[PDB]
From Swiss-Prot, chain D:
Gene that this polypeptide is encoded by: NDUFS7
Classification lineage: Eukaryota, Metazoa, Chordata, Craniata, Vertebrata
Keyword rRNA-binding: no
Protein name per Swiss-Prot or TrEMBL: NADH dehydrogenase [ubiquinone] iron-sulfur protein 7, mitochondrial
Any GO BP: mitochondrial respiratory chain complex I assembly
Hydroxyarginine: residues bearing it: 54
Gene Ontology terms for molecular function: 4 iron, 4 sulfur cluster binding; metal ion binding; NADH dehydrogenase (ubiquinone) activity; quinone binding
EC number per UniProt: 7.1.1.2
Chain's role: Core subunit of the mitochondrial membrane respiratory chain NADH dehydrogenase (Complex I) which catalyzes electron transfer from NADH through the respiratory chain, using ubiquinone as an electron acceptor. Essential for the catalytic activity of complex I.
Its membrane topology: Peripheral membrane protein
Post-translational events: Hydroxylated ar Arg-54 by NDUFAF5 early in the pathway of assembly of complex I, before the formation of the juncture between peripheral and membrane arms.
Subcellular location: Mitochondrion inner membrane
Parent sequence residues shown: 61 to 216 of 216
Keywords: 4Fe-4S, Electron transport, Hydroxylation, Iron, Iron-sulfur, Membrane, Metal-binding, Mitochondrion, Mitochondrion inner membrane, NAD, Oxidoreductase, Respiratory chain, Transit peptide, Translocase, Transport, Ubiquinone
UniProtKB/Swiss-Prot annotation, chain E:
Summary of the function given for this chain in its UniProt record: Accessory subunit of the mitochondrial membrane respiratory chain NADH dehydrogenase (Complex I), that is believed to be not involved in catalysis. Required for proper complex I assembly. Complex I functions in the transfer of electrons from NADH to the respiratory chain. The immediate electron acceptor for the enzyme is believed to be ubiquinone.
Keywords of this entry: Acetylation, Electron transport, Membrane, Mitochondrion, Mitochondrion inner membrane, Respiratory chain, Transport
Any single Pfam family the record assigns to this protein: Complex1_LYR_2
One Gene Ontology biological process: mitochondrial respiratory chain complex I assembly
InterPro entries in UniProt: Complex1_LYR_NDUFA6_LYRM6 (IPR045299), NADH_Ub_cplx-1_asu_su-6 (IPR016488)
Protein name: NADH dehydrogenase [ubiquinone] 1 alpha subcomplex subunit 6
Assembly information from the UniProt record: Mammalian complex I is composed of 45 different subunits.
Chief subcellular location: mitochondrion
Species this chain originates from: Bos taurus
UniProt record similarity statement: Belongs to the complex I LYR family.
GO cellular component terms attached to this protein's record: mitochondrial inner membrane; mitochondrion; respiratory chain complex I
Location in or out of the cell: Mitochondrion inner membrane
Membrane topology field: Peripheral membrane protein
PANTHER family referenced in this protein's UniProt entry, alphabetically: NADH DEHYDROGENASE [UBIQUINONE] 1 ALPHA SUBCOMPLEX SUBUNIT 6 (PTHR12964:SF0), NADH-UBIQUINONE OXIDOREDUCTASE B14 SUBUNIT (PTHR12964)
Swiss-Prot record, chain F:
Pfam families, per the entry: Epimerase (PF01370)
Localisation per UniProt entry: Mitochondrion matrix
SUPFAM superfamilies: NAD(P)-binding Rossmann-fold domains
Listed name of the protein: NADH dehydrogenase [ubiquinone] 1 alpha subcomplex subunit 9, mitochondrial
Keyword Electron transport: yes
Organism: Bos taurus (Bovine)
This protein's encoding gene: NDUFA9
Taxon lineage: Eukaryota, Metazoa, Chordata, Craniata, Vertebrata
Stored Gene3D superfamilies: NAD(P)-binding Rossmann-like Domain
UniProtKB/Swiss-Prot annotation, chain G:
GO CC annotations, alphabetized: mitochondrial inner membrane; mitochondrion; respiratory chain complex I
Full protein name: NADH dehydrogenase [ubiquinone] iron-sulfur protein 6, mitochondrial
Organism the protein comes from: Bos taurus (Bovine)
Annotated gene: NDUFS6
Residues of the full protein shown: 29 to 124 of 124
GO biological process: mitochondrial electron transport, NADH to ubiquinone
Role this protein plays: Accessory subunit of the mitochondrial membrane respiratory chain NADH dehydrogenase (Complex I), that is believed not to be involved in catalysis. Complex I functions in the transfer of electrons from NADH to the respiratory chain. The immediate electron acceptor for the enzyme is believed to be ubiquinone.
Compartments where located: Mitochondrion inner membrane
Sequence similarity: Belongs to the complex I NDUFS6 subunit family.
Source organism phylogeny: Eukaryota, Metazoa, Chordata, Craniata, Vertebrata
Length: 207, 176, 48, 156, 116, 335, 96
C-alpha cells in the first residue's frame, strides 16, 4: 500500500450514504441537502424550522438512536445572508456511528432551543448566544456564560477585533478596576500567508 | 473486553458476617491504613537539597533563549525572520539591513520573554542554528522590563552559555 | 568538565556572572535601531 | 552601642523572621498551578524552607499569581490583594501572569497581572519548572533580606 | 417573502414598545437598591439619569426584532445587577470616571492628533 | 531645540504625552495622584524616593513598562537631586512633613530642600517647575509650618523665577489628614475645639481638583511664573464642618470648648511619639487658622478645573469610619 | 569595537546611541547599558582568506550538519574574494 496516504473505507461511505437518503426520505419537509465527506462523515443540512423534528427523529427512531449530543456550536460566514451556521454533532452508541446536522440563522432570526431533545444543549446554546449572538427561543436560562459581566459584543464573530475594544486596569484614584479603550504597546502583526498559487484543483470553484 | 469494579456479593455465612463485624467494631481496615503511613515514615524521603542539588534535565531542555556565533565570532543569524514567522506568541521582533561590509544581519532582535511560551519552534525553524533555547532556567527578575530582551542581551547569553549550548547541540543534533 | 572540557572559543566569557537582577549591573531594555525620520534643520542665518 | 548598630541588628532579626516564614497564598488559575503543586511535592518540598503549602488569604505573606488572569477574574484578584495584611509581596509565575503570554492579544485577558497589582518577582517560563519557581521564592527571600525599614526609620 | 421574517417576541412596534416600558420601569425602581448594595458614590438621581440616557440612544429604532434583542439584552443586564453577579467595577463602567474628556470640536481634535 | 517629545497616541496608558516629570515627594498623599494622572496619559515619571522601595510599590502599576523610574535621593545631597532632574522637562516639588523630626525641621523641608531642588533644576536646564506652597503661608503666623512656607515660597520665586507656585487650602481625600483628622478625636470622649470652632472659616479643596490643576499647569504655557490659589467652591465654619464630618460618620458629636493654652499642652504630649504624631502644637494652629481670601491670585477656575464640593465626596472619604442622608453644613455667603 | 560617544555612552554594534539631549538616557541612571563587547563585524575581518585551487568552492560553515546550508561560491573575479553569504568567510583562487 501507500505508507503516507490515509486509507479509504468504502464500506462506511456506502453505509452512511444509504442512511443519508433514509433520513431525507423520512423528513422531506426539512432536509435541504445531504452529503458524505471523503473521510466518511455524514452531514444533514436542514431548514431551521426542522430542528426539533429532525433531532427528535434522530434521537428516538429505532434505526438511528443518536442518544448523545457530542457538540453544538456555530460558524460565522459573513458573506452569506444568514451569517451563522449551527452545527449539531450527534453520536449513536447503538450503531457506533456519528452524524452532523447543520442549520442556519442570522443576527435577528431566532432558533428553537434543543434542550427538550438533549439536555446537554443547555450550556452549548448559552455559549453560542454569548460568543455569536444567536438567540435561542424557549431556552430555560439564556445569558452570558464565557464573557465578562457587561461585556458588549460577541467575540467569535468574524468582524469582532482580536483584542477587543476595552481593556482592564487598576486605577488608584477610584480604588477599583476600570475599563478603558484598548491601546497596545505592540500591535498584533497581521501576516499575509496565503500563497498566490492554487493548491487543490479538486475544489476549484467555477468562475 | 470489560470488567466489573464493584459487583461483588458479600458472603452471608456466619464466619464472614463476623469478619465484617470485627472490622466494624475493631477498626481493622483503619489500622491497616496507619500501617502504610508508618512505613513511609521509615523510608528515605525523595527531597533533594536545592540549590546544592538540582533536578535532572536532558540536552533537549527548552530554557532561556540565546543567540549563537560561528567558531570565528561571526553571528549565525542572517535575518531571515523564520523564527519571527513561526513564533506562535509573536514574541520576536526583527529588523535588518545590509551591514557595513554588506552582510545580511539584524539591527534589532527582541524576544519578549513575557509573551514567549518557550515552545522551541524558533530553534526548529532557524536554518543556521542561530537562535536556541539554552539550558538556563534561573533568570527570574525583579521587574517586568528586565524580561524584554534585545539583541545585546541575547548575544550576551550566547557568549555566556556557549560552552553548554554547544555540548547540548552536539548530543542531540542527530535526533533532529 | 575535568574529564571532557568544553571547546574553547575567544568570544566565550572568561568570567561567569550570576543573576544580576536588582543590582546596578542589571539589564535595562532599549531600542537598538537608529532614528528613522531625519527632521529638517532650519538655516542658522536670518533670511533678511 | 550606637543607635545605628542596634537598628542594624533589629533589621536582620525581623528580616530573618519574615523571609524564614514566608506563607504563600497561591492563585492557581491555569497550568502554572500544576508546577506550583510540584514545588510542594516531595521532589522539592517548599515546606522545608518554611514555605507552608497552602495558607489562607488572611494569614499569607506572598501571593503567587500562577496562571492566566482574565478580565472577569481581575476584580477578584485585586479584592484578595487588598485584604492581605502587610508586609505583602506578589510573585508573578509564568508568561500569562507576567505579560499576557500566549494569550497576550485576547479580548478577555489582562496583559500582565502587574497592571492590577504590584509585583516583586517575575518567574519566566510556560510553565516555569518547579525548580525555577523555587528559585523565585528563594530570590524573594534575598530581596526581603536587603530591606532596611528600621534603618530608614531611624534616619527620618 | 423577502420581509416575511420570523419574530422574536413582538409582532409590531406597538408590542415592542410595551416591553421597553416594562423594562424601563424595572430599571428605574432598581437603581436605589443598586446604589445601596454596591455602596456606589453616585446618587440615585445620577444613576437614573444614566438609565435614562441608555434608553435614549436606541430611540431611533423602528425594527421590532432589533428592539426585542435590546430588551432581551437589557433584561440580562438587569438580572446581573439584581443578583449581585456584577461587582462595583461592573456597575461603575457605565460612567467612565477615569477616561479624560475627549474633545468634540474640529480645532481641539486637530491639535491632539489625526483622528477625525 | 531640534524637537520636543512630540506627543503621540490617544492619551491612554500606552500613549506618549511628551511630559518627562521628576516628582519629588511622590510617595505621599498628593504625590500618589500626580503620578497616577501623569502615568494615565503616558508620561515618563521619575520618582526620587527617600523611603524603602517597599513603600513605593503602590506606584509601579500607575504607568506602562518603563514609564516610572525610581531613584534614590537625599534632601541634603545636591548631586542626587541633579541625577533625577537632568533629563526632565518639569520638576514638581511635593516635599513636606506636618511635624518636625529629629533630623529634618520645618526649615529643612520647606526652605532648604525646595531651594536646593529649585537651584539644581535651573542649572540643569529644566523648563517647568511647580512648587506647592500653602494658602495660609504667612511670615507672621502662629504656626511655624506656615511661617516656613512663606520663607520657602519666596526663595523658590527667586531661584527659579519662571516657577508656578500652587497655594491650596487644606486638601480632603481618602489618605488626607483633614477629614480623617476630624474622625479620630472620638477616641477621647469629646471633640475639643478652640472657641467651640467659632471664629474660624475653612475652604477645603478636593485632592483630584488639586491634582488636575497641577497637570493643567504643566500643559498651560500661560502658567509660567504665576502663583495660583486652589480653593474649594464653598466656605465653612470650623464648627459646622466638623459637625458634618460626624454626621456622615454617624458618630456622636460632643463639641466642648478648650482654651488655646490647654490645647497646646495636650498637643505637646502627643509630640513625644517617634511615629506620625496624632496631633502636634503646629497642627492645632493650622486647623484653627482661617483660610485667607486672595482674589488677585488665580485659582482652579482659571486652569480649567471646576472645584468639587465637599458634599459630593465626603461620603467617599468617611465611609470607612462608619460602624457595622445628612444635612449639608452651613456655608458662608460671599457678603 | 565599542567606542563611547561624547557623553560617556557606549555605541552598540548596530550604531545605536542616545543623543545628548534624549530623555531616554534616564533609564540607565543607577543602572547600566547592556552592550556586547564582541563585535561580529570586526571578528569576521580577522579571518584569513582561504586560498583554494578551483573555480568553485563550497561552504557549509564548518561542523557539517551543525553549520549553515551548503552553498557554492564562484571565484572567477580576481579583483575581489568569494564571500560566503551565511558565515562571512572569504575565499580566493590561487594565482588564476
Ligand atoms: C513504632 C513501633 C512499631 C510498632 C508501632 C505500632 C504499629 C501499629 C500499626 C501497625 C499496622 C500493621 C497493619 C496490620 O496488621 O493491620 C491489619 C490487621 C487486619 O486488618 P484487616 O481488616 O485487613 O483483617 C482482615 C480480617 N478481618 C476481615 C477479620 C478483618 O489489623 C488488625 O488486625 C488490628 C486489629 C486490632 C486493633 C484493636 C485496637 C483496639 C485499641 C487498643 C489500643 C492499644
Ligand atoms: C521566642 C519568641 C520570641 C523571641 C524574641 C527574640 C529573641 C530570640 C532571637 C532568636 C534569634 C534567631 C536568629 C537566628 C538567625 C540564624 O539562625 O541564621 C540565619 C542566617 C543564615 O543564613 P541565611 O538564612 O541568610 O541563608 C539561608 C540559606 N542557606 C541555608 C543556604 C544558608 O544567618 C544570618 O546571617 C541572619 C542574621 C540574623 C541576625 C540576628 C541578630 C539578632 C541579635 C539579637 C537582637 C536583639 C534580640 C531582641
Ligand atoms: C460461634 C461459632 C459457632 C456459630 O456461630 O455457628 C456457626 C453456624 C454455621 O454458619 P451458618 O451455616 O452460616 O449458620 C447460619 C445460617 N443462618 O452458624 C449458625 O448457624 C449459628 C446460629 C446462627 C445465628 C447466630 C447469631 C450470632 C449473632 C448474634 C449476635 C451475637 C452478639 C455477640 C456479642 C457481640 C460483641 C462481642
Ligand atoms: N495634605 C494637605 O492638606 C496640604 C494642604 C496645602 C499644602 N500641602 C503641601 O503639598 C505637599 C504634599 O504633601 P502631602 O503629600 O499632602 O503629605 P506627605 O505624606 O507628608 O508628603 C510628603 C512627601 O515628601 C517626602 N518628605 C517629607 N520629608 C522629606 C524629607 N526630609 N526628605 C525627603 N522627602 C521628604 C515624603 O517622603 P517619605 O518620608 O514619605 O518617604 C513624601 O513623599 C506638601 O508640601 C504639603 O505641605 C498639602
Ligand atoms: C517606646 C517605643 C519605642 C521607642 C524607641 C525610641 O524612641 O528609641 C529611640 C532610640 C534612639 O534615640 P533618638 O536618637 O532620640 O531616636 C528617637 C527616634 N527618631 C530617631 C526616629 C527621632 O533608638 C535606638 O537607639 C534604637 C531603638 C530600637
Ligand atoms: S520558544 Fe517559541 S514562543 Fe518562545 S521565542 Fe522561541 S518560538 Fe517564540
Ligand atoms: S535567528 Fe535564525 S530563524 Fe531567526 S532570523 Fe536569525 S537566522 Fe532566521
Ligand atoms: S504561562 Fe504557560 S503554563 Fe502558565 S498558565 Fe500560561 S500557558 Fe499555562
Ligand atoms: Zn559559510
Amino acid at each position: 500500500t501507500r505508507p503516507t496516504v490515509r486509507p479509504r473505507n468504502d464500506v462506511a461511505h456506502k453505509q452512511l450514504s444509504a442512511f443519508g437518503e433514509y433520513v431525507a426520505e423520512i423528513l422531506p419537509k426539512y432536509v435541504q441537502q445531504v452529503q458524505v465527506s471523503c473521510f466518511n462523515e455524514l452531514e444533514i443540512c436542514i431548514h431551521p424550522d426542522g430542528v426539533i423534528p429532525v433531532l427528535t427523529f434522530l434521537r428516538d427512531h429505532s434505526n438511528a438512536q443518536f442518544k448523545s449530543l457530542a457538540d453544538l456550536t456555530a460558524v460565522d460566514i459573513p458573506t452569506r445572508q444568514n451569517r451563522f451556521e449551527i452545527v449539531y454533532n450527534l453520536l449513536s452508541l447503538r450503531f457506533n456511528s456519528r452524524i452532523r446536522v447543520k442549520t442556519y440563522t442570522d443576527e435577528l432570526t431566532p432558533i428553537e432551543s434543543s434542550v427538550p431533545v438533549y439536555k446537554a444543549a443547555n450550556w452549548y446554546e448559552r455559549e453560542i448566544w454569548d460568543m455569536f449572538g444567536v438567540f435561542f427561543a424557549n431556552h430555560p436560562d439564556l445569558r452570558r456564560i464565557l464573557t465578562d459581566y457587561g461585556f458588549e459584543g460577541h467575540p467569535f464573530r468574524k468582524d469582532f477585533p482580536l483584542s477587543g475594544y476595552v481593556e482592564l486596569r487598576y486605577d488608584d484614584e477610584v480604588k477599583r478596576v476600570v475599563a478603558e479603550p484598548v491601546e497596545l504597546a505592540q500591535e498584533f502583526r497581521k501576516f499575509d500567508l496565503n500563497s498566490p498559487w492554487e493548491a487543490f484543483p479538486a475544489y476549484r470553484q467555477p468562475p | 473486553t470489560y470488567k466489573y469494579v464493584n459487583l461483588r456479593e458479600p458472603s452471608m455465612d456466619m464466619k464472614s458476617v463476623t469478619d465484617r463485624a470485627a472490622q466494624t467494631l475493631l477498626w481493622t481496615e483503619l489500622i491497616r491504613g496507619l500501617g502504610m503511613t508508618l512505613s513511609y515514615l521509615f523510608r528515605e524521603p525523595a527531597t533533594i537539597n536545592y540549590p546544592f542539588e538540582k533536578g535532572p534535565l536532558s540536552p533537549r531542555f527548552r530554557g532561556e533563549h540565546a543567540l549563537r556565533r560561528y567558531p570565528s565570532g561571526e553571528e549565525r543569524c542572517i535575518a531571515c525572520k523564520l523564527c519571527e514567522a513561526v513564533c506562535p506568541a509573536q514574541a520576536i521582533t526583527i529588523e535588518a539591513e545590509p551591514r557595513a561590509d554588506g552582510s545580511r544581519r539584524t539591527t534589532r532582535y527582541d524576544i519578549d520573554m513575557t509573551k514567549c511560551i518557550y515552545c522551541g519552534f524558533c530553534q526548529e525553524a532557524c536554518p543556521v542554528d542561530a537562535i536556541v533555547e539554552g539550558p538556563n532556567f534561573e533568570f527570574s527578575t525583579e521587574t517586568h522590563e528586565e524580561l524584554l530582551y534585545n539583541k545585546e542581551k541575547l548575544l550576551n547569553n550566547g557568549d555566556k552559555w556557549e560552552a553548554e549550548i554547544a555540548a547540548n547541540i552536539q548530543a542531540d543534533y542527530l535526533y533532529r | 568538565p575535568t574529564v571532557k572540557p568544553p571547546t574553547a572559543r575567544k568570544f566565550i566569557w572568561t568570567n561567569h556572572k550570576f543573576n544580576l537582577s536588582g543590582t546596578p549591573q542589571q539589564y535595562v531594555p532599549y531600542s537598538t535601531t537608529r532614528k528613522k525620520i531625519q527632521e529638517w534643520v532650519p538655516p542658522s542665518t536670518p533670511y533678511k | 552601642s550606637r543607635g545605628e548598630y542596634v537598628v542594624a541588628k533589629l533589621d536582620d532579626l525581623i528580616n530573618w523572621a519574615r523571609r524564614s516564614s514566608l506563607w504563600p497564598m497561591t492563585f492557581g488559575l491555569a497550568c502554572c498551578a500544576v508546577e506550583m503543586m510540584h514545588m510542594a511535592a516531595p521532589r522539592y518540598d517548599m515546606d522545608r524552607f518554611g514555605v507552608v503549602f497552602r495558607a489562607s488569604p488572611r494569614q499569607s505573606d506572598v501571593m503567587i499569581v500562577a496562571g492566566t488572569l482574565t478580565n472577569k477574574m481581575a476584580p477578584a484578584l485585586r479584592k484578595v490583594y487588598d485584604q492581605m495584611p502587610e508586609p505583602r509581596y506578589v510573585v508573578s509565575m509564568g508568561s500569562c501572569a507576567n505579560g499576557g503570554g500566549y494569550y497576550h492579544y485576547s479580548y478577555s485577558v489582562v496583559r500582565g497581572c502587574d497592571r492590577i497589582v504590584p509585583v516583586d518577582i517575575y518567574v519566566p517560563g510556560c510553565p516555569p519548572t518547579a525548580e525555577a519557581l523555587l528559585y523565585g521564592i528563594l530570590q524573594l527571600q534575598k530581596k526581603i533580606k536587603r530591606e532596611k525599614r528600621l534603618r530608614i526609620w531611624y534616619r527620618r | 417573502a423577502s420581509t416575511s421574517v420570523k419574530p422574536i417576541f413582538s409582532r409590531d412596534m406597538n408590542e415592542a414598545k410595551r416591553r421597553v416600558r416594562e423594562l424601563y420601569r424595572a430599571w428605574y425602581r432598581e437603581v436605589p437598591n443598586t446604589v445601596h448594595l454596591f455602596q456606589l458614590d453616585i446618587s440615585v438621581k445620577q444613576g437614573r439619569d444614566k438609565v435614562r440616557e441608555m434608553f435614549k440612544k436606541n430611540a431611533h429604532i423602528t425594527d421590532p426584532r432589533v428592539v426585542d434583542l435590546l430588551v432581551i439584552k437589557g433584561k440580562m443586564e438587569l438580572e446581573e445587577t439584581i443578583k449581585v453577579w456584577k461587582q462595583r467595577t461592573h456597575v461603575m463602567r457605565f460612567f467612565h470616571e477615569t477616561e479624560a474628556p475627549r474633545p468634540k470640536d474640529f480645532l481641539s481634535k486637530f491639535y491632539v492628533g489625526h483622528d477625525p | 531645540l531640534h524637537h520636543a517629545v512630540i506627543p503621540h497616541g490617544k492619551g491612554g496608558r500606552s500613549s506618549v504625552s511628551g511630559i518627562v516629570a521628576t516628582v519629588f515627594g511622590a510617595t505621599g498623599f498628593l504625590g500618589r495622584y500626580v503620578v497616577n494622572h501623569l502615568g494615565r496619559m503616558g508620561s515618563q515619571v521619575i520618582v526620587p524616593h527617600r523611603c524603602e522601595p517597599y513603600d513605593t510599590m503602590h506606584l509601579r502599576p500607575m504607568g506602562d513598562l518603563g514609564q516610572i523610574i525610581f531613584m534614590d535621593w537625599n534632601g541634603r545631597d545636591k548631586d542626587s537631586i541633579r541625577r533625577a532632574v537632568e533629563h526632565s522637562s518639569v520638576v514638581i516639588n511635593l516635599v513636606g512633613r506636618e511635624w518636625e523630626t529629629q533630623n529634618f525641621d520645618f526649615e529643612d523641608v520647606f526652605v532648604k530642600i525646595p531651594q536646593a531642588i529649585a537651584q539644581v533644576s535651573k542649572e540643569a536646564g529644566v523648563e517647568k517647575f511647580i512648587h506647592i506652597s500653602h494658602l495660609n503661608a504667612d511670615i507672621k503666623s502662629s504656626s511655624k509650618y506656615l511661617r516656613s512656607k512663606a520663607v520657602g515660597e519666596k526663595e523658590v520665586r527667586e531661584t527659579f523665577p519662571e516657577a508656578t507656585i500652587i497655594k491650596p487650602a487644606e486638601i480632603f481625600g481618602r489618605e488626607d489628614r483633614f477629614l480623617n483628622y476630624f474622625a479620630n478625636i472620638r477616641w477621647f470622649g469629646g471633640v475639643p475645639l478652640i472657641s467651640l470652632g467659632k471664629k474660624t472659616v475653612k475652604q477645603p479643596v478636593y485632592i483630584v481638583d488639586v491634582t488636575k490643576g497641577i497637570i493643567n499647569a504643566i500643559k498651560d504655557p500661560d502658567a509660567r511664573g504665576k502663583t495660583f490659589a486652589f480653593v474649594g467652591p464653598s466656605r465653612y465654619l470650623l464648627f459646622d464642618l466638623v459637625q458634618y464630618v460626624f454626621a456622615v460618620a454617624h458618630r456622636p458629636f460632643l463639641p466642648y470648648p478648650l482654651p488655646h493654652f490647654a490645647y497646646r499642652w495636650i498637643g505637646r504630649l502627643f509630640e513625644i511619639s517617634p511615629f506620625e504624631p496624632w496631633t502636634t502644637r503646629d497642627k492645632v494652629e493650622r486647623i484653627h487658622t482661617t483660610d485667607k481670601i486672595l482674589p488677585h491670585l488665580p485659582g482652579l477656575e482659571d486652569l480649567g478645573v471646576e472645584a468639587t464640593p465637599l458634599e459630593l465626596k465626603a461620603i467617599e472619604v468617611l465611609r470607612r469610619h462608619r460602624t457595622y442622608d445628612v444635612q449639608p453644613a452651613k456655608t458662608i455667603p460671599t457678603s | 569595537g565599542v567606542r563611547t560617544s561624547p557623553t560617556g555612552e557606549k555605541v552598540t554594534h548596530t550604531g545605536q546611541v542616545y543623543d545628548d539631549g534624549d530623555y531616554r538616557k534616564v533609564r540607565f541612571v543607577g543602572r547600566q547599558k547592556e552592550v556586547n563587547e564582541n563585535f561580529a563585524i570586526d571578528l569576521i575581518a580577522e579571518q584569513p582568506v582561504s586560498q583554494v585551487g578551483s573555480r568553485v568552492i563550497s561552504c557549509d560553515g564548518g561542523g557539517g550538519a551543525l553549520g549553515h546550508p551548503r552553498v557554492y561560491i564562484n571565484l572567477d573575479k580576481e579583483t575581489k574574494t568569494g564571500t560566503c553569504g551565511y558565515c562571512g568567510l572569504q575565499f580566493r583562487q590561487q594565482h588564476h
